[PDB]
Amino acid sequence: MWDVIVVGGGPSGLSAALFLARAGLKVLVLDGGRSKVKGVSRVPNYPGLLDEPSGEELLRRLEAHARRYGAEVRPGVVKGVRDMGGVFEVETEEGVEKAERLLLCTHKDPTLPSLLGLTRRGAYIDTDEGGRTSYPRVYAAGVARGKVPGHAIISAGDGAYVAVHLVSDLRGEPYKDHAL
Amino acid sequence: MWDVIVVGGGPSGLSAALFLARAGLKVLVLDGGRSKVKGVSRVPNYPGLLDEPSGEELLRRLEAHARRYGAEVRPGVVKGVRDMGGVFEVETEEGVEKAERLLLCTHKDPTLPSLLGLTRRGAYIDTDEGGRTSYPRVYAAGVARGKVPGHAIISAGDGAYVAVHLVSDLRGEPYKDHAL
Numbered sequence: 584m585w586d587v588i589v590v591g592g593g594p595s596g597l598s599a600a601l602f603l604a605r606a607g608l609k610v611l612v613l614d615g616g617r618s619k620v621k622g623v624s625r626v627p628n629y630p631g632l633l634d635e636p637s638g639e640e641l642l643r644r645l646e647a648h649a650r651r652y653g654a655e656v657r658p659g660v661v662k663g664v665r666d667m668g669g670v671f672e673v674e675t676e677e678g679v680e681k682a683e684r685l686l687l688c689t690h691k692d693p694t695l696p697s698l699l700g701l702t703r704r705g706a707y708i709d710t711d712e713g714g715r716t717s718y719p720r721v722y723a724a725g726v727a728r729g730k731v732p733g734h735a736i737i738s739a740g741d742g743a744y745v746a747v748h749l750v751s752d753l754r755g756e757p758y759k760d761h762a763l
Numbered sequence: 764m765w766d767v768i769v770v771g772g773g774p775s776g777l778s779a780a781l782f783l784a785r786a787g788l789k790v791l792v793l794d795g796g797r798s799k800v801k802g803v804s805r806v807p808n809y810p811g812l813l814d815e816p817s818g819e820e821l822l823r824r825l826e827a828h829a830r831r832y833g834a835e836v837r838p839g840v841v842k843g844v845r846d847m848g849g850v851f852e853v854e855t856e857e858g859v860e861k862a863e864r865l866l867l868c869t870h871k872d873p874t875l876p877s878l879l880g881l882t883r884r885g886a887y888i889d890t891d892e893g894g895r896t897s898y899p900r901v902y903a904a905g906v907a908r909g910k911v912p913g914h915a916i917i918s919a920g921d922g923a924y925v926a927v928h929l930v931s932d933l934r935g936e937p938y939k940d941h942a943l
């Protein structure tokens with residue numbers, strides 16, 4: 584059982600996981616391993632990452648960062664999603680995981696949104712400003728919701744943005760993850 | 764003498780500057796030095812920066828990243844902005860700086876939006892999906908256009924997103940900064 588299952592382990596999904604975990608939520612990231620930044624030998628435009636590491640290295644750091652605060656990240660290709668009336672049952676080849684909320688950071692892959700019959704905006708998932716889809720308790724971020732042309736920092740930022748509003752919705756008040 | 768003048772040198776402005784500069788544009792960032800993240804002793808939630816640097820250090824790294832690819836970043840408070848000869852004239856300590864486009868990454872400060880008569884949306888500047896304001900060739904990003912609750916990665920991502928669409932507008936074609 585999880586508070587939130589994030590489908591997609593690219594920049595948007597891993598960034599969302601970091602924020603959700605820091606908000607005290609039990610979060611699991613299920614990733615199919617096809618992030619578009621994976622083959623990049625050097626990412627020179629992720630503001631602040633001055634060593635301009637490879638896409639694989641970027642993803643490794645993002646995963647490490649999310650785990651540092653409690654997030655779980657596991658390889659997995661979701662092939663099914665069932666609304667059980669209170670919780671979503673997400674199925675991969677390994678089995679099933681349950682969560683009250685879903686956050687789709689699946690790039691352009693229509694698999695997830697089609698299983699849920701989500702309303703679309705062009706070839707992407709339709710959402711309101713904060714990332715809420717047509718289906719209650721289902722959110723979307725990054726390229727999945729039209730933040731294109733896609734870029735790593737754009738997706739990472741949107742993943743955090745949608746996560747922050749998911750937390751705000753859950754808590755019943757504005758959520759800010761600010762340090763001193 | 765500038766393709767774009769970015770007002771505000773916080774995460775959104777510096778991220779936008781990095782992308783604009785990498786697009787080959789002449790970009791100038793004028794910053795008042797009041798970034799909200801500057802006082803943080805340790806930023807623990809900027810996806811990927813595992814060393815969790817102070818807000819001051821983060822800003823220095825973002826500035827370095829933008830300068831690395833050609834952006835000029837300097838202290839300065841923008842108070843006067845006129846539209847003449849098809850370009851925006853900005854008064855500065857070094858004389859008038861002219862630009863074809865203006866990008867406001869000024870957080871919640873309503874001073875410039877009010878002077879320019881920009882259409883508002885709540886406590887922020889109204890924009891379309893890509894960051895275009897009600898004033899042609901004037902864009903906005905980050906907290907300035909309502910990406911709140913504000914966070915460094917959220918503003919950095921939005922700055923890049925708006926910059927990418929600004930370049931797309933300038934070139935008349937979807938722009939992408941991807942490694943080959």
Ligand SMILES: Cc1cc2nc3c(=O)[nH]c(=O)nc-3n(C[C@H](O)[C@H](O)[C@H](O)COP(=O)(O)OP(=O)(O)OC[C@H]3O[C@@H](n4cnc5c(N)ncnc54)[C@H](O)[C@@H]3O)c2cc1C
Pocket residue numbers: 590591592593594595596613614615616617618619620621622623625626627628629659660661662688689690692694695724725726727732733734735736738940941942943
């Ligand atoms: C050749 C190329 C070069 C690029 N170079 C750059 C560059 O230099 N700089 C830059 O900033 N951007 C670059 N990009 C773009 C960048 O990689 C993307 O913008 C970024 O990866 C988008 O992040 P995202 O989280 O939205 O999606 P992605 O990182 O693509 O992640 C989507 C994830 O969801 C998973 N997923 C989808 N469906 C399922 C499912 N059913 N079950 C489980 N998991 C699923 C995928 O396997 C994947 O890991 C490049 C892209 C390409 C194609």
Ligand SMILES: Cc1cc2nc3c(=O)[nH]c(=O)nc-3n(C[C@H](O)[C@H](O)[C@H](O)COP(=O)(O)OP(=O)(O)OC[C@H]3O[C@@H](n4cnc5c(N)ncnc54)[C@H](O)[C@@H]3O)c2cc1C
Pocket residue numbers: 760761762763770771772773774775776793794795796797798799800801802803805806807808809839840841842868869870872874875904905906907912913914915916918919
């Ligand atoms: C106490 C505190 C703690 C925080 N801790 C965190 C944290 O741990 N993690 C996190 O992710 N976020 C944190 N934040 C929020 C984070 O700092 C903001 O989300 C981020 O700085 C927003 O970036 P921005 O680019 O939108 O605006 P800002 O960084 O606020 O930058 C706006 C910039 O524009 C300049 N400017 C405005 N008007 C003008 C003008 N007329 N001429 C020239 N320059 C102008 C300002 O001087 C400023 O430098 C914190 C905020 C506060 C207040």
